Design a binder for this molecule. Structure first.
Ligand code: A1EJ0
Ligand code: A1EJ2
Ligand code: A1EJ2
Lengths: 334, 332
């Protein structure tokens, strides 16, 4: 296994790669100019110490900001339209707030809450102009709840956890499928077109479970309400015993790993470090030597396809969070 | 150059991490909270997130059930001058790090010290003798901690105290009385903090830290009344205060305020103040990375005030550098 020192060095290598190729307007080196290519940029580069590069992304994001606090364009990927439209918005809010861009995050978080379903506590999956039926998913709700934490809107975070709690206990067939979406009225949306994770198979989408586990663990730390800890503990046990191991192998397993590392610092259970260390080590070995993570690229490239840039900035963040909670976990418990 | 200011901050952060204690404490010769209250925030901005979380672990083990850290404390200024100065940086550092339980409890206690009649924050801690007086530094850092934790109403109330303190100055061209009583009237007695604005006797951060907080509140709110008061305090330090206002060790607050004001307004005088202070702080840096007024050798620890100044300059040079680079870009 690799140590938190080595998980961190892998994070700083990718963060160096990004800063080397950042555009003068602040955009990260994406082959296509879309918001889903750099929405984790402010947060990731801040945790890596590249604050001027993170502030540059904040300048690029601010110049794209609409009067209502949203960035509806440039968007291309289908998932950032009607699957989890607020995935970009949630990371933008956290990254702007930790940077001290209080005007940016306040406007981003204001719009995020305009998407909240007051009847259920979830957040709408499709953007204002995107066709949809008002469905709310676990990813939009957990990332908005996490963004609610960093901005101090704890009541919104609490209402988001109620949605995830109701979504968990409403699972009709949890051993075979995880329905990560509810309709606009609070019922678990078991429709064919709704996101549903095939648990016993190896077909990705695990972060629809891992990100709620991350959010719920953070809200527990914020509140020490055991209801949030028990629900996060269930989701982790669910992904460990009931889920196919691809839940900890697929590219979206970093959310589970961050949650396990957080849970280890908060509980001291050794299996949480096991899941956290194995996931963090797994992502380290996949890193290209130039710093970036990618699926098809292997050479000294000057830019990346939008999915690889986002994955690269996402792994700077996940390896850092896992590394700092494993390090603090040993100090506290061991 | 924002590039050079950042490298100086990363060298001081490297110096701190290389000497951090196994329990998370920064290398202070005395185990006191005033030696490392800026450690969580400073190390996080430098990328040393494992070292920042270690400070969070050490701070967490000191937290009392009401959210304060009354011990270990030794410096009088962290007893009855601006007691909450330590708590303010602890709250911010804990929050940007994700330690929401640590930051919420710290912020909860800070708010119990707010004076609801004036919006100011009590200068002396619970155990410490005093008369309910509130100072501009306790109020500014509490307001900035409130902004980072989303307590905007508490921040707006802190600015109201600063605005009341400002227009209430009985003699601003000769002295800045930074304290008011519990009733809201400016305290002019000799025991109150008073900046002799025409003498090189330090304590300028009683004006500069208000200017920083008020500028950040303006960005959070776009209420130009906060920008105007921030502008008046920056003009006050530039034209009416001694040049030591931008030379004393406590000038980093005005520099960060100027760097932030430059990004928001674009007036190049704010860029001059930020660069001048930033390069000044850069030139005072020892080659090993730490900042000290006495030490020059390769030391394994520092006097608590030198260790705090070292972490403080990590943050200020980063803030000054990030706002000058972004200020250069938007006003290109
Ligand atoms: C660099 C500097 O002069 N900083 C000032 C405030 O931040 C100073 O008052 C410090 O707090 C010092 O530890 C004494 O209190
Ligand atoms: O890198 C992956 C992106 O987050 C998106 O989910 C596309 O797969
Ligand atoms: O040690 C130097 C600090 O800046 C301060 O003077 C301590 O009181």
């Amino acid at each position: 296994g690799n140590s938190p020192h080595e998980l961190k060095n892998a994070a700083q290598r990718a963060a160096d790669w990004l800063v080397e190729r950042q555009r003068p307007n602040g955009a990260l080196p994406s082959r296509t100019a879309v918001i889903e290519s750099c929405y984790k940029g402010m947060w990731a580069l801040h945790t890596a110490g590249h604050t001027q590069a993170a502030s540059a992304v904040a300048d690029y994001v601010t110049s794209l900001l609409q009067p209502d606090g949203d960035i509806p364009q440039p968007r291309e990927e289908r998932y950032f339209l009607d699957v989890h439209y607020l995935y970009a918005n949630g990371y933008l809010t956290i990254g702007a707030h930790v940077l001290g861009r209080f005007g940016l995050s306040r406007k981003l978080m204001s719009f995020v809450e305009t998407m909240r379903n007051p009847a259920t506590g979830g957040f709408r999956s499709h953007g204002p102009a995107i066709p949809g039926d008002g469905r709310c998913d676990s990813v939009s709700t957990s990332i908005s709840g996490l963004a609610a934490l960093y901005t101090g809107r704890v009541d919104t975070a609490r209402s988001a956890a109620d949605f995830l709690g109701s979504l968990w206990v409403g699972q009709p067939d949890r051993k075979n499928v995880f329905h990560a979406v509810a309709d606009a009225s609070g019922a678990v949306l078991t429709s064919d077109d709704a996101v549903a994770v095939q648990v016993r198979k190896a077909e990705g989408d695990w972060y629809f479970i891992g990100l709620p586990a991350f959010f719920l663990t953070a809200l527990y730390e914020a509140t020490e309400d055991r209801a949030y800890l028990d629900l996060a503990t269930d989701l982790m046990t669910y992904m460990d015993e009931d889920c196919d191991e691809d839940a900890f192998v697929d590219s979206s397993c970093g959310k589970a790993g961050v949650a396990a590392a957080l849970l280890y610092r908060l509980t001291g259970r050794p299996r949480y470090r096991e899941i956290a260390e194995g996931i963090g080590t797994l992502l380290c070995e996949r890193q290209s030597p130039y710093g970036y993570w990618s699926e098809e690229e292997t050479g000294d490239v000057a830019d990346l396809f939008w999915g690889d840039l986002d994955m690269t900035a996402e792994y700077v963040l996940w390896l850092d969070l896992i590394g700092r909670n494993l390090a603090s976990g040993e100090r506290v418990w061991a």
